[PDB]
Amino acid sequence: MWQRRQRRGEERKAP
């Protein structure tokens, strides 16, 4: 839910 994309560099799903 949170801090999932933080490992990729986005943190959260965004457009």
Q: What is the DSSP string of 1-15?
A: --SSBTTTT-BS---
In Å, how far are 1, 9 from 13, measured between CA atoms? Answer: 9, 10
CA distances from 3 to 6, 13, 14 (A): 5, 10, 13
Could you give the CA distance from residue 13 to residue 7 in angstroms, rounded to a whole number? 12
Residue type, 8: R
State how far the Cα of 15 lies from the Cα of 2, in Å rounded to an integer.
Answer: 16
Experimental method: NMR
- Comparing CA positions, the residue from 15, 14, 13 lying closest to residue 1 is 13
Query: Tokens in use for 8?
Result: 């990729």
d(C-alpha 15, C-alpha 7), whole Å: 17
Q: Are 5 and 11 in contact (CB under 8 A)?
A: yes
